Design a protein around this nucleic acid. Sequence first.
RNA 1: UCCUGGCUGUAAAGGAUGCGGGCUAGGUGUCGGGCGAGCUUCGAGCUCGCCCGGUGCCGGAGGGAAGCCGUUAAGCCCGCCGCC
RNA 2: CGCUAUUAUUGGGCCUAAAGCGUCCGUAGCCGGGCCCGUAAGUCCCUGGCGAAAUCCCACGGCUCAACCGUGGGGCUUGCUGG
Lengths: 129, 196, 223, 55, 89
Amino acid sequence: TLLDPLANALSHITNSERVGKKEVYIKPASKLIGEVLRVMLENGYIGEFELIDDGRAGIYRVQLIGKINKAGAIKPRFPVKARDYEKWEKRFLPAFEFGILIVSTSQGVMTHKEALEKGIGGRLIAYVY
Amino acid sequence: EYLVPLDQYLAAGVHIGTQQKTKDMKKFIYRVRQDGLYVLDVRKTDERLRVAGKFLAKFDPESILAVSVRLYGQRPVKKFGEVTGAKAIPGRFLPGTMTNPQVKNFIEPDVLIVTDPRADHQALKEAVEIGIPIVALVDTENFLSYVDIAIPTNNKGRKALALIYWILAREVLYNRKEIESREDFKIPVEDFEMRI
Amino acid sequence: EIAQRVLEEWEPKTKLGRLVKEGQITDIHEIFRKGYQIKEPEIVDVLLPEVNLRENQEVLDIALTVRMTDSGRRIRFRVLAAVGNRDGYVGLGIGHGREVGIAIRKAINYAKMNIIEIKRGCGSWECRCRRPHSIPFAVEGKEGSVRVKLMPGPRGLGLVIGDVGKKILTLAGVQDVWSQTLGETRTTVNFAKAVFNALYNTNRVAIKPEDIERYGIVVGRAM
Amino acid sequence: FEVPVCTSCGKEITPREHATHFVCPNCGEAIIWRCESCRVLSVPYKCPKCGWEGP
Amino acid sequence: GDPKRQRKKYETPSHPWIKERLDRERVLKRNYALKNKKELWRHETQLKEFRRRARRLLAARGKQAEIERQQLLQRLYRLGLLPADAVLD
RNA sequence: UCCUGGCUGUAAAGGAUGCGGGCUAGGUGUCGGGCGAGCUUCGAGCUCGCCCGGUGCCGGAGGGAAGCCGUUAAGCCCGCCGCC
RNA sequence: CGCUAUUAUUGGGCCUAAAGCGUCCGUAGCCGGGCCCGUAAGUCCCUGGCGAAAUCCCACGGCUCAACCGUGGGGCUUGCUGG
Ligand SMILES: [Zn+2]
Ligand SMILES: [Zn+2]
Ligand SMILES: [Zn+2]
């Protein structure tokens, strides 16, 4: 059944981008999804996401601009230290600063560049490029 | 308002569709009769005709193709060519006119006009291969694939094809400024039609 | 030199050839990203005179194929050939014939007609310079059963790939790369076409205006 | 030089693609580009100046 | 366990009979008056070691990293293969 | 070979295609239920359109060694078990 | 050992080539919808005590250079433990 809504959201995004759509609706919403969308907005992969309220849960409405090649969720959510990031970079990305690993830390969801600047690790949940 | 009194459109049969449909044509569709027949809106036809007139008037006359494999579209196309200086290929479109420079009549135009993208699937393909824009008259059963301007029109009626190409020629001449105004165009709509 | 030697005895058949012969198209990069069709090799002989040098004309594969009739066996020759300016322009062609010279000539003509431009850069974790000696990011290519993946490498790492890929990337202007493959790589035609498509797919990756100076991206000729 | 960008999506045009470009049939100040994918999938385009919203 | 054994300081090629490598090594042997291919191969191995050290150190964070960087650059300047105002590229 | 009461536990037992969930153009038939319009001989009746669910034929991107599959995937994702 | 993505966590495959149980219901086990409060076991950071030497990497110095030996700086010790 439904195990992970984050993966569903990200795959729906990849497919709609690959086929050339403008807007994308994500039915089972959460707070991780909002935070991931926030990171992606700050880094410049989407535009103008908003939350719509029905009585069940939230829905997310997103606009795409054509700056995504791939996007997906990392399972299992691997723990990672502040000393072993290049490994997962080489594993999930095509160049040395190209895309974003999204990490979940005890200080919030962030990109691995910010996490490394602060000097902390965490768990891996997604990647985008 | 209109380019022509609405009842003339209606008597020609511009608002008559097939017993089929297509998601790509829900815009141009307006209604469904109790018989299964679909009805097209005429406002959008008028506007797309004006736009197409401007577009084709912005081009060199003698680099323009008009193609109609259908039989009720060979005479209208021929007179459109006579009136606008544009080339017209009624019958068959020998495959290779655009891709084979070793045929007798080899040409490479700038824009293409099509009466039915389903019957004229050969010219459409060659045009796609050489990379040019496409103006097509489309009905309810037609798709919009490889089509950059679409004119909603009944494609199978002789009166409809005649009226459409008549309006198009008039608009092209106007926007080109070969004439001062409409009603300076004294060709009758009863010439463009196929004779019996 | 031989510009007036190649341009005087040529009469254009198409409209692009006429545009080139008159002098309104003057650089190689003005013929690509439009929907133009290329049906004359003299267009490329005019815009890239370097593809005519014999040292830029690798012949890759020659095969002998047989068709049965009740009389005997009819023999045909198939030649896979590569052409390229060594500064970002490559072409691949196949030619058939009843003898070997005809096949070679047709292969080189079809290779001239199938010209593409590519992007170059550094993109490696271990070099991080800004010079177009490699590809700027990893790319994928496929043909038949063959799958190829190309990854950027550091300077001095010369072309870790099979020999057909070696020659194609050398004609492309690339000097450093790592590679992975799957499938029937012993069939030269499919391997060559997969590497050609991998090189083509460098234009399919979206980038932001900040990546062009991080990786030193160059489109076509450099400097 | 500069690489053109499609008007429906935001992707760059590839060299040997079956893309096209024309002038807005409504006003006539902008240039419309269309890549092979939007042409074959009937993805609608919209003028940047006046928003004509053609097929 | 197994104890230590001294190991070679030169490498051999992966295939012995490639025309390009043969031609290049022939030219070098002739123009520098070498007796064998071992000498060429061990000089090449020196180079490869330098090149691997550089590739590793590059973008490595810490203190031992910069220490080793400066060590490498000074060693090269002393050997005579680089000027003073040089960099890791 | 059929009936009553029990054992055996196998087949091209084949869609030669394990089960659940989200996504990626549609068209045209048929079966059941519901809604809305028009006909009517006033019939649990006829025709047209829409929503849900089943079952078929075509088909574009896309996939595949190909034959072919193609929103009833042999496509991209999240899972578990059996097998080579 | 590698070649071998022919043992595949990274990283294979099961219509026709080897390969879906004849089909169902269910025990352990693995995977599990959305918000709020708590704890802080896993996870992350900082620090104390341990993980012999030789072996491995780097620079300097002594045997003609080197191999070898010495001084120092790092790793290895697949980790345990106190805050
Ligand atoms: Zn580099
Ligand atoms: Zn596009
Ligand atoms: Zn406009």
